[PDB]
Write a protein that binds this ligand. Structure first.
Ligand SMILES: Nc1ncnc2c1ncn2[C@@H]1O[C@H](COP(=O)(O)OP(=O)(O)OP(=O)(O)O)[C@@H](O)[C@H]1F
Ligand SMILES: Nc1ncnc2c1ncn2[C@@H]1O[C@H](COP(=O)(O)OP(=O)(O)OP(=O)(O)O)[C@@H](O)[C@H]1F
Ligand SMILES: [Cl-]
Ligand SMILES: [Cl-]
Ligand SMILES: [Cl-]
Ligand code: NA
Lengths: 75, 75, 74, 75
């Protein structure tokens, strides 16, 4: 649950499924500039150079974020 | 120019003014959970626990992000 | 992505692929520390102080986590 | 005070003075590859491309680190 996408309808950041988070995070860690994934009948590209997810069918843009863990870690 | 808010009308992340970026970043660094700033008389609150900016005149919620620079630096 | 500083050489040093994966798996899991071995020596990484501890001698060497830029560059 | 330097004598990361932290952090945020500061009777260079600080009088090297705050912030 390290990646999130923003929902403008509700005004909240939302989690991805475990499998879609893994697909996104694997591409992030591999140095890719973008990644494609599917959810049901929906098709998306996450653009890491802009931190935006684009619906491939409609062009709708949803912002994305990467959660960050504190360094150093707290006790 | 390290903080950004997402403009849903244009579909792009946007920088704050130098003054507003400083107000936000100083609150971030001091451990505050939120911060108020203005653009002229227009009032906003950034909520750091949700990474959302609340327009205190329209109520619209826009996501925010903190840009992160690479560690170590290149070159 | 994890590095330890070698004061003998004056440089940050990478871990082996397996030790990097062990450390990073504990980091991502939210643990406060992680055990590994290097060269028949036992070590603990303490994430709350960002140091590696030699379990035999007590010697502390600093560690660091490299960070990727957000957003990514084109 | 977000920057730290490692003290091998005590085995701990240590904070900078407010002013020296500010000098370092301003160069960091400005995109510079290194920065010099003076503390006491010594000049030091922080090399951001290696995350190492060099004492320019003696040549002694100490590792540095940049603390990171959690995103999003906890309540
Ligand atoms: N309630 C909702 N309203 C509108 N749109 C939604 C949505 N809930 C998810 N979406 C869209 O869907 C993407 C993947 O969201 P995600 O949770 O990974 O989707 P699924 O559970 O179907 O995953 P999977 O079964 O592995 O394909 C997400 O960015 C968002 F764009
Ligand atoms: N106790 C100590 N032992 C060994 N070395 C030390 C040290 N204390 C500071 N150093 C050296 O000096 C640098 C700046 O350390 P810093 O605290 O910003 O400098 P000042 O002393 O001017 O601070 P202040 O007393 O608060 O005004 C620091 O990286 C390190 F290299
Ligand atoms: Cl949006
Ligand atoms: Cl969509
Ligand atoms: Cl020194
Ligand atoms: Na040295």
């Amino acid at each position: 649950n390290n990646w999130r996408w923003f929902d403008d309808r509700s005004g909240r950041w939302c989690s991805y499924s475990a499998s879609n988070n893994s697909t996104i995070d694997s591409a992030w860690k591999s140095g890719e500039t973008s990644v494609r994934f599917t959810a049901g009948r929906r098709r998306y590209t996450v653009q890491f150079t802009t931190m935006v997810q684009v619906n491939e069918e409609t062009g709708n843009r949803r912002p994305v974020m990467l959660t960050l863990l504190r360094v150093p870690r707290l006790n």
